[model samples]
Each structure stands twice: as C-alpha cells, then as structure tokens.
Target: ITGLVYDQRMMLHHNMWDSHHPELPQRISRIFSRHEELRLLSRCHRIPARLATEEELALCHSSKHISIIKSSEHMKPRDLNRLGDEYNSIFISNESYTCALLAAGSCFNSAQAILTGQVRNAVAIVRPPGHHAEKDTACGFCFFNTAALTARYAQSITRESLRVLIVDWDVHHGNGTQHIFEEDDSVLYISLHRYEDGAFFPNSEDANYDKVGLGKGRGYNVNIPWNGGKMGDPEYMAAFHHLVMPIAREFAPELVLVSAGFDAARGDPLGGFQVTPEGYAHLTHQLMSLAAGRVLIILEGGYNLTSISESMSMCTSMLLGDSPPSLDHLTPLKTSATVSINNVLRAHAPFWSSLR
Candidate 1:
C-alpha cells in the first residue's frame, strides 16, 4: 500500500503581507484537491500529521536556529517581519513555527512507515518547503529541512547502517540539504538544478558541478548544474539515463527520497524550465526501480497552481503503480544540458566505478 501524509492545518503558514506570494498556502491545498478529484486519495494509506520533537529537529538543525523560529510563535507581526528579514526570502507568521514542525514530522513519519515496511512507499504533501532550510539559518522559503530530517530519522530506525539516496530535482539547488550532509558518506545526495554559474537564489559556488563532497563523502554528492535554456523533458531524461540512474544503481541505496519540486514545470513564474507532468511521472517511475521500490517523496517548491498540482498528481499516480504516459515526441537534448551532463560525469568519474 502507498501511504500519504497531509494535514489541512499546514495551510496556516502563509505570507501575512501578500496573498500573491509564490509560496502561498494553496500550493498544498491545490495538490490535495487534485489528488481527491482523481480519486487517488482513497486507495492509499493515510498517515496522521504530528509535531516533530525538539530532538528530531536537532538532527539536522542547531539549537539556536530552533529557538529563533520557536520564538516567532508569540512575536508581534513587526517583530516577525524583522526576524524574517534576518533570513533569506522567508516570512514568519505566528503559526509558521508550528506548521514547520508538522511538515518535518509528517516527513519523518512517512519515512518510518516506509522503513518499517508498513507501506511500499509514501508521499507527504507538505508546505513551507524544507530543502532550503539549513542547520543554522533558513533560506529560500524553507524553515526546517524536512528531507534532511527524514534521512536522519530513517538511519536511526534501521538495524544496520542504511544507505540513503536523496534525489533533488527542484529547479533550484537544495543548498541547505547539501550543506547538512556534505561530509556524511552514509547518504548520497544528487541534485539536478538550474545553476547559472552562481547566479541562482542561494548563489553559492557549492551548487556548481565540482564541489562534490568533503573527506570520506568525496564523490558521494553529485550536482548536475544546468546553465539554463528552458530545459525540457529530453534534457532531464538524458541526465537521468546518463548520470542519475547509473550512479544510483551502483550505490544501491536502501531507501530513496525525492525532494520533489514542480517549479520546473512549464508554467512556473520563477522557474524557467519547461518540464511537463508526464516528464515528472517518468522520473518517479525510474526511481521506483531502486531500493526494493522503497521511495518517499517530500514536496519542496513549486509556484504555478495548475502546473504543480497536475505534476504532483502524476507523481502520486506513479507511486500507485500507474504507468506514465508516453512523451509524444522525444526531442534531442539541448547543448547546455549535454555539456552539463558531461561535466558532471567527468567530475565524479573517480569515485563511481559505474561512471568510469
């Protein structure tokens, strides 16, 4: 059975100043409603949302960071605005802290369900995305690093050391998630994102193809940085076929976690890429072939209502064992994508025998 984690209470974490903000509460609501419309929710196991304990948050975040977010619970709007200003592109409503906890907890429970074999796989339709939240600070629209926390939680519950694979296909790089596990070899982190040579949101050179990982984690971290030219399904499919699946199969992860973001979909206001819902379904289908079909998808960032909702439904349908629709015509890969793929392949060649 497939397990789903969603709670309407998470919709409370919205921007107080602007209803038109890209990270609106409707991101989750729209996806949930679409899933309902398609009758997908009825066939899955539902996992209740809960608050993540301080210890669980501590797994990937610092105490100071936790306290800072916790203090926003009772702060005045002005104070909350100031606090939000301290971080990058974040807004702090009174319920933001609680909602962030629920997001992290929902993902943690989803991981547990998959780890304990209670469900074949699960998807957590959560909000205030967590991929950008770091150990000491919040960046982008994230506050708690949900995927990172889930990875740690999965490792804690396993009998032996677990090999976890985090596939981040968000249009933007998951700088926070990469930073949290940069030196840990137990988890393999692969991010396919738009990196215009440090011109992106977080704007760090670490998102480039050469950062790899540190010490024992060398080559374990892979970054397929796109230079950006409205990359579409063909480009993404090429990357997965050449770089993603090869390394993942060689690593043979025990569990697969996708930082699923649909901003790359055609209609997103922020992300310029043109991936379709069908493209996302194909990607999810490929990942299901690994880790004994143990996959946990955690929602990250996506702005366009129609684009994100449809793309999300497609992925969820793949989780339910539905076949992905065929791409009418497979276009050739763009020059930028081809160059990026080769660059990533050369960068990690030494560590992954599969690449060599």
Candidate 2:
C-alpha cells in the first residue's frame, strides 16, 4: 500500500508547544526530530511531504489572522541560542514565521491529498499543533488552525452542502476547531478531551446534552469530556462504543478527518490522560468502519518520542488492515478505574432521544 506523509521543511525548527510549559525547543525538537530520524533510520525510503499552497490555507483561516502572522516576519530575534521561544510566543524574526508557514502549509497539503485522492488516506506530520489555535488568536503553541482549515477546505470542495465529520481525540480540547465550524451545519465535529468546567479557551460555557448547536448547526457538535487521568483501553473503547459510533453513524460523512495527536498516549507530558498504543488502533478501526475506509488522519501533538512512533505505528497499521496483535506487550485497562461517561448520557438523554 502507498502512503503519503505531509511535512514541511521549516517544521523541524519550530517549537510552539512552549506555551503551556517553560521547556526549551531543544527538548521538543529532540522528540520530533527522533521521529524524523526514524523515517530514515528505520530504513523507509518512500517518505516525502507535500508543501501546501497559501490559496489552500484560506479555506478555514481568516485573512486577518493570516495577515498578522505574515506581518510578524519583520521582527528581529534577540538570541541565537533561543530563537524558538520568540517565535513560540509570536515574538518572532522573519525566519521563525517562515518556519510556521511551511508547517501550516503541510497540513493544507495533507487535506488536499485526501480531497484530490492523491492517496486514499494520508497523514500530516505537523508541529505547533493547530487544534488549540482559534479564529482570532493563537494560544497553546498553535498559530494557525491546521485541522480546521483542512475541514473547511474539504467542505468547500465536495459540494455546496455535503456533510463532513471531523473527529478529534486529542487529550486537550479542540476548542478552536469546534469554534471554526460552530455556525456551519454542513460540518459535524466530535471531540473527546479532558473534561472540566468547560469555560477554558473558546469558553464552552457549560456541558450537557442540549448544548448541541444552534440553527442549522444544531446537534452537530459533540463533546465527550473525560476525567483527569490516564485513559487506557476501557475509556477509549467506551467512547468508541457509545459516543463516537452513535453520532458518526448519524452524520453519514463522505469523509472523516482526524486530529491525531500522540500526546494523549501514556507518556506525554503535555496531557495527563494515558491512551495506550492499542487504544489508538481501536480508535482508528472504528472511524475507518464509520467512513468505510475513506478517512484522513493528520498528526498533531505528541511530546514523547517512543510513544509517538510506537502508537502511531499501531494507528497506521490498523488502517492498513493488520491482524490484531497480542495486547500483552502493551498496558491494558484497569478493572477499578472508571470514566463518568454514563452521567453524560443520563443527563443528556433528550439530545440523544431526539436524534435520528
């Protein structure tokens, strides 16, 4: 099987994940660069990335956000040693913004591949991961919304009104992504993130079944918030059996796009939730079944190098139809550990009841 990987040249030098922590780009780069090295060190000869065009980026981002980022190119970086921090906070030099452009462009190219059928499925190995970035501003190491832009790009291509489904399983909220499509009924969004009071970035005021959507977009956005802990097999499978399937089946999407972040796995420092390697395989399997193998999985955030490659291998292998491997090598779910997902359905029975 042929696989396409979308990665930009400048992405190797950017460190946008520094927003939440005081870590250095050297640390972050060590993680990702290892994966890049693995691409060759593993002796895989056919890995090449497509650089996306600016016209494609306009699909989801406002010109204002795009223009401001381009304008940052005029700033002078202070330190030769710490260039990543300035660009990390949008305190940049011309070189730094140039790096972000290629990274974001890689995402657009990944989406273009799926829409154009360059490969039936593809992955966008990107950085400064875009799910957290909003329409108006950038927060959480993200400058532009890559997944959101791609969905809007795809939405515009298929037809004037074909329905699209975007499933994000990142541990942190896809708050910016949901914000992008909140008003458009043609796009359906489902995100499973660490649940809190919900008034975080993009400020989802409250959580209940009824907060579906308004007007034409009603009942289209589904958020299944999980507890603050490691999410092994049990929680992931529960989400698949209950939330992901119930909604994805109803949407009946022409294609399903994923914001595939490895940060949710057991070893990531950014997110406390722990989804093991096998949990990701199961997730890929379910979404593939829902879309009839017509899906695009884009890489977002994953801080740990080992978990990133191993878990990602599981996900890609799943999409390619591997016979299930023995799970004894990976961690399994705990018998006593539990997720409060039942309360979600019970509290929001009316929303589920009303849906066809």
Candidate 3:
C-alpha cells in the first residue's frame, strides 16, 4: 500500500495540541521512520504518503472556501482564525489553513494515484485534518474535509453517477462533511459514532437514519449513533461487521475513503473507547480487506500521544500484511459483550432495513 504523495504540509501544527505532549517534528519524524522501518521488515512492503497539491482541492469545495483559505495563506493568526472558525477549529494559526489545503489536496492526489495505478492503496498522514469541515463550515478538529474532497473528485472524473462511499469511524460524527454532502446521492456517507441523542462534541449529527437525504441522497447517508461513548473493541467490531462492511459491499463503491481518527482509542481524552494500542491494526486490516484493499486513510483527531503513536504503528504493520502487533495479551470480548451488541443492532434495525 504505497501512494506517491506530494509532505509540504507538516510545517503547520497546533501548539495547543503539542505543547505538553510530543512536538509535531518528533511525532512526524516517527511517522516517516516508522514507515521506513516497516518497509525494511517486509520483503517489499512500502507505505508512504508525500505531500498533496492545491489544484485538486476545488473538486469537492466551493471556490469561495478555497479563496478564503488562500487569502489566509499569509495572514496573521487572528485573521486566519476568523476565516477558519466555520471549520470549528480553535487551533488555527498562520500555517493552519495552508496545512489544511495540503491535507485536502493530498487526498485527491493520493486517490488519483490509485485510480491511475500509481499505487494499490495509500494513507495521508497529515495534520489539520479535514473530515469535520463541511461545505459551509468546519467542526470537530477538522478544517477542509479532505475525505469528502477525494470522494467528490472521484465522482467528477467518472462524469456519471459514480458511487463513491465514505466510512467514518471517528469517535465524533463528521457533522460538517455530512451537511456538505447530505444532498448529493452520488456520494454515499456512512458514519458510526457515539451518540446519546446528539450530545457529542459536534452536536449537529441529528440527521436520523431514516432521514437519509434529500432527493437522490436520501438513502445514501447512514448514521448509526450509539450510546456508551467508551466504545470498546467488541462493540465497535460488532458495529463494523453488522453495519459498515455490508453497506459498503452493497454500495459497490468505485472508491472508498476513511476518516481514520485514532482518538477513539481507550484512554484518549476526546474519546473513552477502551481500544488498545493494537486495535487500529484490526480496523485498518478489515478496511483493507474490503474493496479489494484499495483504500485511503487520513488522520483526524487523536489527542493521547501513546495510543496515537502505537496504534498508528500497528496499523502500518497491518496495512503491510505483516505480523501485526499482538492483541493476545489484551482482554477478550467480555463474554457478555453480546448484550450491547444485541441492543445496538436492535436499535439500528431500521437503519439496516433501510439499506436493504
């Protein structure tokens, strides 16, 4: 899984997120070194993402949004924050939107590389992530909706009804992306998030399962909001098995995009799910199995330093199809995990049926 990428965006970082924790340079240096280490361990395994470009960003974004981001390219931090708050980010700085543009741009370039046979699969490991950014606003920590940008670009290149599917497993709902694509059917957006009746951070994920979309987009949007913010491995795996995978197969998507936020891991400040260091390995492993393993993963939110780093390492290993980090020492599904499984599925019956 190697996508020739364009890494000019790493220059942007949120000091707020990095202050007490590891700095961006250290975290990022680990990212590349980890990929290189993985490559050395595998026979010919290579997983790398270069920086992405800007011309490709206009596909899913309005020209106006692009113009604003461009105008803020060299502006002061205060000026940049004003233009970027709609994206729901408090970490905006002079370099924030520039990184966002590069983040969004990479998805398009990475996806195009796959379509053009540059690589079978790829993952964009840039910051100032974009899953939360909508057509008109950005929420959660995201700013440009890079995954949506990729899906839209795919639809345009096909020039007809292109079935593009996006599966967001982030702990928080991508309220912005959902709002942006809610009215378009060509792009199918499915999200499995924690919700006790729309009380999550981005609070706008109220579009019920049956509400689907307007016109053709009605049934294309799937939101399976569950309770228990601390979603354990069993609950999440069950959701993926019962909800995400089947619908993705049914969609028969020409391309697949993942809002790969690691914040859902157990102990993460933003998320309470008891996902261990190796959980993301299985998540990425499963996602790679689908669509014949042609996939794109973009980093979103993961505040806890240890979980983020280790999970990413294991995920990289899994993507290489090598001996993934062992979850053997970890606790197995609490034999009673089935109870939550049944309840969630039961509550989601209408959603499953609608997809049918």
Candidate 4:
C-alpha cells in the first residue's frame, strides 16, 4: 500500500510574493487539489507528521546553522531580507521555522511508514525544498536537508549498513544534498539537473560531472547534468536505462529516497526542461523495482502550478499500484544529452562495473 505524509502548516509559511515566487504554499494546495480531483488522495494511507526535533535536525545539520534559522523567526521584514539574501533564494516567514520542521518531519514520517511495514512505499509532499540546504547552511529556497535527514533517520531505525539511493530529479543540481553526503558511501546520491556549465544558481565545482565523491565515497555520488535545456523523457529515459538504473541495480539499496522535484516538467519558470507527469511516473516505477518496492518520495522544487499537480498525480497513481499511462512517442536524446550521459558513465565506469 501507499502512504502519505503532509501538513497544512507547511503552507502557513508564505511570503508576500505569493504566486510570483516559485516555492510557495500554493504548490502544495494545487497538488492536493489535483490529487483530490483524480481521486488519488483516498487511495493513500495518510500518515501524520510533526515538527522535527532538534536531535533529528542534528542528524544532517550543524547546531549553529539550526540556530541561525531559529533566530530568523524573530527578525523583521528588513532583517528577514538579510537572512534571505544570506541564504540565497530562501525566504523567512514568521512561521517558516515550523514549516521547515514539518517539511523535514514529513520525510521522517514517510520513511517511518515504509520501514515499519505500514506501507510498501510513501510520499511526503512538503515544502521549503531540502536538496539545496547543506549541512552548515541553507540555500536555493531550502532550509533543512529533509531527504538526507530522512535517509539518516531511516538508517538509524533499520539494520546496520542499510543502503539508500537518493535520486534527485530537480531541474537544478542538488548541491546541498551532494555536499552533505560527499564523503559517505552508504547513501548513493544521484542528481539529474540543468548545469549550464556551472552558470546555474549555486554554480560551483560541486555540481560538475567529475566531482563524483571523496575518499570512501568515491564514485558513490553520481551527477547527470543537463548542460542544455529542452531535455525530454527520451534523454531522461536513456540516462536511467544506461546509467542510473544500472548503477542503482548494482547498489542494491534497502530503500530508495527520491528527491521528487517536478520542476523539470514542461513549463516551469525556473526549470526549463520538458518532462511530463507520465515521465515522472515512469521514473518512479523503475525505482519501485528496487528494494522490494520500498521507495519514499520527498517533495522538492516544482514551480508551474498545473504541471506540478499533474506530475504529482501521475506519481501518486504509480505509488497506488495503478499502471502508468503509456508515454507518447519520444524523440531521441540530443547530442548534448548523450554527451552528458556518456561523460557520467565514463567517469563512473571504474567504480560501477555495471557501466560498460
């Protein structure tokens, strides 16, 4: 069965920007509405979420960093701007701390469901995207690393050496998640995003194709950068078929955590790719084949209203054991997509014999 973790408190943290902003409460509402419309909500076993404790936050964040976020709640609008600017693409509403807590907690709740036999798989529709939030800082509209924190919490509850596969499909590279787990081999972090040769937001060497991982974590961190935009299902499918799935199959994770960012959908303002909802369903379906169908999807970046909702509906359908609608005829991967995939495969070939 499929489980769900969500809280309207996540939407309580809102800014004056409203619809103008990419990350807002409306994103969740739209997703919930679409899910309701499609009769998908009832299919899910709703799992309640609470504020994540400080101990839980400490699993993947520094104390000082957590304090900084806590302090932001008391700041005025002017002072909030400073914190937001410092955090980069992050806004601090008075209730943002609570929202952040629930966002992180939702992932923990979803993971709990899957770990305890409550559900075969689950999804936590949360906000304040966590993929961009690093161990010591928050950036790119993220406050805390929810997925990473959940992975840590999952490993904590499960047996020793419980492997996790984090597949980040957000349009922007998950530099924060990558940085947090760069030296750890237990969690395999794979991201597919628009790199634009480091010109994108959080543009840094960390988002490159060659910065796989460090020390024991060498070759564990995989990055599939979409150097150019307009990448569709064919390109994404090719990468999964040729690169991600093969390595993931070999990794043999106990649980798969998807940083389910639908920003790559057809018409997101921030994410310029062209992935459809059905596309996300296919990707979700493939991950389900691993870990005995144990997968937990945590919400991330998704800007466009209709696109995010539709994409999530498709994903919800997949989690509920519904068959994914057949995708339309897809075009072949462009030269840029092929080049990026090959670069990643070549770089990781030595580590994962799964790659040719």
TM-scores vs. true structure, each candidate: 0.99, 0.80, 0.82, 0.97
Worst 10 residues of 2 by lDDT: 38-47
State the lDDT at 235 in candidate 2: 73
Model 3, residue 351: distance off in Å is 7.7
Let me know the TM-score candidate 3 reaches against the reference structure: 0.82
lDDT string for model 4 (106-144, tens) is 888888889899899988888878999989998888999
TM-score of 1: 0.99
lDDT of 2: 0.62
Best by TM-score: 1
> Per-residue CA lDDT of candidate 2, range 90-109, in tens?
33335455555655666555
Scored by lDDT, model 4 comes in at: 0.88
Which pairs in model 2 have colliding backbones?
Answer: 230-274, 231-274
Give Cα distance to truth, residue 26, candidate 2, Å. Answer: 8.2
**Residue pairs clashing, model 4:** none
Q: After superposition, how far is residue 92 of candidate 3 from its true place, in Å?
A: 2.3
Q: Clash pairs of candidate 3? A: 5-50, 6-50, 6-51, 7-51, 86-138, 87-138, 88-138, 130-145, 213-218, 266-275
Best-first order by TM-score: 1, 4, 3, 2
